[PDB]
């Protein structure tokens, strides 16, 4: 049952459930209605018609991708902009890692999906090559199903804002989730610091700092504390998973050496050293807004 999507950031990333990864709430809400039900055809032969099992799967996956693309448009208040394109890219990528069996959330309806996929593709050493081949010949058609809703609504005015080549690019799930997390961080940060400058900006009297007495400014430092501590937590485990995944992988990704490389690619105006300060609570604006000293 594929429900309306929850408000962005209503539920922050989840590092407590699986303690080696932080799972975005978008992934938890990935539409998998048809992928979870799918049942066997009539055959009763020992070995079924796998070609037609894959065609059955394609249809089911196209329906779930279409619904996902519709709800992601509704989550964006029916705005066809770059934030919607990024979501389409992130969920297509997650569909892909589910199809290929390289998905990092192994919970609930995802384990059932994995058994449905094992009945179509088999389980021998080579089934993963087979699943990857079929994903690669299907992923652009799956992407087109995710764009069915925007396309249908805009009619004559539709234009290709989202780029097919970017969205179908295969890279490990952890790379894509860091990209998604970096964009979430960059939208929380200016919101979280301006919520400080409401209370701690300037100096009380002419010489004291407001945080050394003013209680409205101390509760604002206590909340930015809870937030930056989470961001720091989330960045640590995702970078750990990145390092674990990178050198446990042989398909190399020219241009990505560390997690910072990904944020630099993804974020305009990314500063590695200002970011390392921001999350370690040693950045310049946190000091003179929150530290007594």
């Amino acid at each position, epitope marked *: 049952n594929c429900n309306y999507k929850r408000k962005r950031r209503e539920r922050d990333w989840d590092c407590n459930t699986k303690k080696d990864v932080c799972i975005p709430d978008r992934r938890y809400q990935l539409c998998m209605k048809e992928l979870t039900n799918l049942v*066997n055809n009539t*055959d*009763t*032969n*020992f*070995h*079924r018609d*796998i*070609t037609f099992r894959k065609l059955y799967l394609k249809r089911k996956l196209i329906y779930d991708a279409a619904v996902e693309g519709d709800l992601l448009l509704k989550l964006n208040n029916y705005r066809y902009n770059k934030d919607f394109c990024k979501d389409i890219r992130w969920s297509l990528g997650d569909f892909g890692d589910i199809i290929m069996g390289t998905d990092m959330e192994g919970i609930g309806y995802s384990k059932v999906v994995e*058994n449905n996929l*094992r*009945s*179509i*593709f*088999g*389980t*021998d*050493e*080579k*089934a993963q*090559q*087979r699943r990857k081949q079929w994903w690669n010949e299907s992923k652009a058609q799956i992407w087109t199903a995710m764009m069915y809703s925007v396309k249908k609504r805009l009619k004559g005015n539709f234009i290709w804002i989202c780029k097919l080549n970017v969205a179908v690019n295969i890279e490990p799930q952890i790379y894509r989730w860091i990209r998604e997390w970096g964009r979430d961080y960059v939208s929380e940060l200016p919101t979280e610091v301006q919520k400080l400058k409401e209370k701690c900006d300037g100096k009380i009297n002419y010489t004291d700092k407001k945080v050394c007495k003013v209680p409205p400014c101390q509760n604002a430092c206590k909340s930015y504390d809870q937030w930056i501590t989470r961001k720091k937590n989330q960045w640590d485990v995702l970078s750990n998973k990145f390092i674990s995944v990178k050198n446990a992988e042989k398909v190399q990704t020219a241009g990505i050496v560390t997690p910072y490389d990904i944020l630099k690619q993804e974020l305009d105006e990314f500063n590695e050293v200002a970011f390392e300060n921001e999350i370690n609570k040693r950045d310049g604006a946190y000091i003179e807004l929150c530290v007594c000293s």
Partner: antibody
Amino acid sequence: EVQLVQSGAEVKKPGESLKISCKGSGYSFTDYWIGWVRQMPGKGLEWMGIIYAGDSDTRYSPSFQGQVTISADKSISTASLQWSSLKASDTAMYYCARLAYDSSGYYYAFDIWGQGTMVTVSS
Amino acid sequence: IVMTQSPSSLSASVGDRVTITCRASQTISSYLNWYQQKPGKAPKLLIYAASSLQSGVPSRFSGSGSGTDFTLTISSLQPEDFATYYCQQSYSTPLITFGQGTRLEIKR
């Protein structure tokens, strides 16, 4: 129709080389493992080895490792078994067979069999 | 993984019930198949996953067991059922092992 067709019976002298072949049709040849099985006259089935047609990953039984070479050619959907120098003890029927999986995908079995190639080795 | 079938030969008349056993040297759960072979014919997959019939196999065939002891039963032998039966562990995919076969002879 899904089929394995093996090459014709062979009569050879000791010391000759020989390659017998097995052609698949009616399915995606590169997606399945192909096994090879020996049956001496009047005896039972001996697994010899298996090959994945898609990338030529090859496993041999200990008893056939180094005695024989299993290979494959995807472009013509063929798996092969070859000896560099035959002995009279190689006289036997040889089967190829497709390994496939049940409706759950966990249980493998040999479901399509070639008709068998008889190889007779004598001086 | 060594597979031992027994008996190696069995005589019975049309109408009889017969039972063939197959022992595994270590547990293999239900990863056991059975094949039938008539003389000058290629083996035919008969049972898989210890007890599932292949299509077209008459219901008088059944397969039993899980772990190391496995059974093939023919509730009432038909003339076409006189053949050789092989078991085969499917536990170490794709490394295969067969049993040595049990031959059905017509008692008379």
